[PDB]
Amino acid sequence: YNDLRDFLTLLEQQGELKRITLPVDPHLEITEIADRTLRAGGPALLFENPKGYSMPVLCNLFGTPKRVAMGMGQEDVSALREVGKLLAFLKKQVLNMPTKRLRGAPCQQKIVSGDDVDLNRIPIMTCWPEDAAPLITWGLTVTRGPHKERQNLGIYRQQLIGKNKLIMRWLSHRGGALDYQEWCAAHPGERFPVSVALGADPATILGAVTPVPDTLSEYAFAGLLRGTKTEVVKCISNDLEVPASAEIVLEGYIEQGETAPEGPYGDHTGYYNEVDSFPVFTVTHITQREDAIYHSTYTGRPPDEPAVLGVALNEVFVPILQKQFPEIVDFYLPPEGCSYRLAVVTIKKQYAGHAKRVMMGVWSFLRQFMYTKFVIVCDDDVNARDWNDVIWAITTRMDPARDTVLVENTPIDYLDFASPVSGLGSKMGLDATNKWPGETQREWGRPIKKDPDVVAHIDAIWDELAIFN
C-alpha cells in the first residue's frame, strides 16, 4: 500500500522529485520557485529547509500531467478515459467500495490539543504579495451531513486567522457547505464537527478533486483508481475518518454563526477576488507523523497545479463527447484559459459546415462547457495541445470574417467581469477547418507531406550523424 512517501521515492528515482536544501521562505519565495518550475515542465519540489520552520514543504506535486498519471498507478493520462466510460453508466455493485479502518495510524504519532495548538508552527505559504494572510491550499476537508453516512472530501482554501482558527471557504454548492447548512437546520446551535487531512496518498488526493456524485464518497472512487480500498483512521475528537497515511491532520468544529472576512486572495483566474464572509473552523487537535512533511500549492495566473490537474481530469469527458459526436478526435481545454474558458476540438470533417455543428455541441451538450467562450475547431492533422499546430491552422485555413461565429446574450459565469452584464455575454467560435467546395471558390492548398522512406532512413543514421555529441 503506497502512502505518499512511497510515491515520493518513486518520483525521486525517476528524476521527478528535486530536494532544495537552500533556505527558502514560505512567504512568497516558494510560490515564485514553483511557478518557474511548473512553467518549464520541471519536477515536483521538496524544500527541506524552509526559513523559520523545521517541517519540509512539498509542492508542485501534480505540476505535470505525467505525474498525475503516475499518481493513479498508470504510465499515461488516458486511463482517465476509462473512468469516463464508467461514470457514463451510472445515469456496478462492487463500486459500493467502503474504507478499510485501521486502529492506529502514523498520522497520530504526535498529538497536540487545546491551548497547545499553534498553526504558526506549520510552514503555511503566503502565495501572492497582496494576499490577506497565509493560506492552506491542499487540505482534504472531510464532513458528514446529518441525513446520510457518506463522507465528502473537498479541497477548500483556508485562511489563517489565529493560533487555532481557519476560515473555511467553501462555495455554497460544495458537499461540505451543504452538509453544514443541513446540520444547522437539523441541530440548531450545535457545533459542526470537521477534520482536514494534509498529505494523504495520491489516489485519495486525486479522488477528492474528481467530480463524483454527491451521493458517493470520494474515498470509494480513490479505491477504484488504486485497485485496493482506501485505508483510513477514526479521528480522535469525532467520528470522521481520515487517511491513515496523512502527514498532518487538523480536527475541530465550526461554531454556528461564527464567520470572518476572507481574503482578498489571488485565484486561478489570475486576479484577486475581493473580501467576503465565510465560516470559521476552530482547531482543537493537530495530529501528525514523526518527520511530518507539509503538502502545499498555490493558485494564480494559469497555468498552475490546479489547472494541470483540471486538464488531466477533463480526459474523463472526451469519451462522453465522442459517443455523441464520433467525428471528434480530441477535445482540450488549455490550463492557460482558466481551465474552462477556451476549448480546442479536432474532427474528421465529413461535410461543408460541419465545424459549426461541433461548436454548437460544445456549447450545448454538457453543462461543464456551457460557459466556454472560445471554441477553435480544426482537422485531425492538428495536435490540439500544441499552439504551433493550432496557430498554424488558424493562420492558414481561416478568413477571419467568414469563418468566425459570434453569438450574443449567452450564459456566462457571473464572476467573469469581462462580460458586459453579470451572467450574460458572447461567445466566439473559430472555424479553422479546411474549406470544402461551397465554403470557398478557391483551389485549397495541398499540405507538404514527408516521404516516409526518407524519414525512416534518417532515423537509422541519426545516431551515427551525431549532431549533438
Ligand X SMILES: Cc1cc2c3c(c1C)C(C)(C)CC=[N+]3c1c([nH]c(=O)[nH]c1=O)N2C[C@H](O)[C@H](O)[C@H](O)COP(=O)(O)O
Closer by beta carbon to ligand X, 138 or else 183: 138
Residue whose C-beta lies closest to Na ion: 218
For residue 424, what are the CA distances in angstroms to 5, 268, 333, 367, 415?
47, 21, 21, 16, 11
**Interface residues for ligand X in 135-164 (CB under 6 A)?**
137-138, 152, 154-157
- Return the residue of 174, 341, 373, 435 that touches ligand X, per CB under 6 A: 174
Binding site annotation covers 191?
no
Go through the chain and tell me how many residues it has.
469
Distance from the first to the final alpha carbon of the chain? 43
351 lies in the binding site for its own copies (CB under 8 A):
yes
Neighbours of 129 (CB within 10 A): 9
106 binds, among its own copies, ligand X, Na ion, none (CB under 5 to 8 A by kind): none
- The verdict on whether 267 is a catalytic residue reads yes
Distance CA(260)–CA(133), nearest Å, equals 13
Cβ(224)–Cβ(216) under 8 Å?
A: no
Distance CA(292)–CA(122), nearest Å, equals 10
Closer by beta carbon to its own copies, 132 or else 352: 352
Binding mask 370-409 for its own copies (x = CB under 8 A): x-------------------------------xx-x-xxx
Q: Write down the catalytic residue from 35, 201, 267, 403.
A: 267
Closest separation in Å from C-beta 343 to its own copies = 14
Q: Which of 204, 240, 239, 238 is nearest to 222 (CA)?
A: 204
**Nine-digit cell string for 448:** 507538404
Cβ(349)–Cβ(379) under 8 Å?
A: yes
DSSP 410-455: EE--TT-TTSSBTTEEEEEEEE-SPPPBTTBSSPPPPP----HHHH
438 lies in the binding site for its own copies (CB under 8 A):
yes
Distance CA(40)–CA(183), nearest Å, equals 46
Residue whose C-beta lies closest to ligand X: 155
- Return the residue of 37, 143, 151, 152 that touches Mn ion, per CB under 5 A: 152
**Interface residues for its own copies in 86-125 (CB under 8 A)?**
88-89, 91
Distance CA(71)–CA(203), nearest Å, equals 6
Distance CA(92)–CA(90), nearest Å, equals 8
Cβ(152)–Cβ(217) under 8 Å?
A: yes
Helices 218-226, 202-209: axis angle to 10 degrees equals 130
Closer by beta carbon to ligand X, 165 or else 169: 169
Binding site annotation covers 171?
yes
415 binds, among Mn ion, Na ion, its own copies, none (CB under 5 to 8 A by kind): none
Closest separation in Å from C-beta 70 to ligand X = 17
**Interface residues for Na ion in 203-262 (CB under 5 A)?**
218
Binding site annotation covers 251?
no
323 lies in the binding site for its own copies (CB under 8 A):
yes
β-bridge pairing 424-431 and 158-162: unpaired
Closest separation in Å from C-beta 93 to Na ion = 22
79 lies in the binding site for its own copies (CB under 8 A):
no
Closest separation in Å from C-beta 425 to its own copies = 8
**Nine-digit cell string for 276:** 467576503
- Return the residue of 398, 410, 416, 434 that touches its own copies, per CB under 8 A: 410
Helix (H) or strand (E) holding 71: helix 65-71
Closest separation in Å from C-beta 214 to Na ion = 9
Helix (H) or strand (E) holding 320: helix 318-324
Binding mask 174-203 for Mn ion (x = CB under 5 A): -x----------------------------
Neighbours of 186 (CB within 10 A): 11
Residue positions in the annotated binding site for Mn(2+)? 152, 218
Per CB under 8 A, residues contacting its own copies are 85, 88-89, 91, 323-324, 351-354, 356-358, 360-361, 363-365, 370, 402-403, 405, 407-412, 421-424, 431, 438-439
Contacts with Mn ion by CB under 5 A lie at 152, 175, 218
Residue positions annotated with a catalytic role: 267
Residues that bind ligand X (CB under 6 A): 137-138, 152, 154-157, 169-171, 174-175, 209, 211, 297, 299, 306, 309
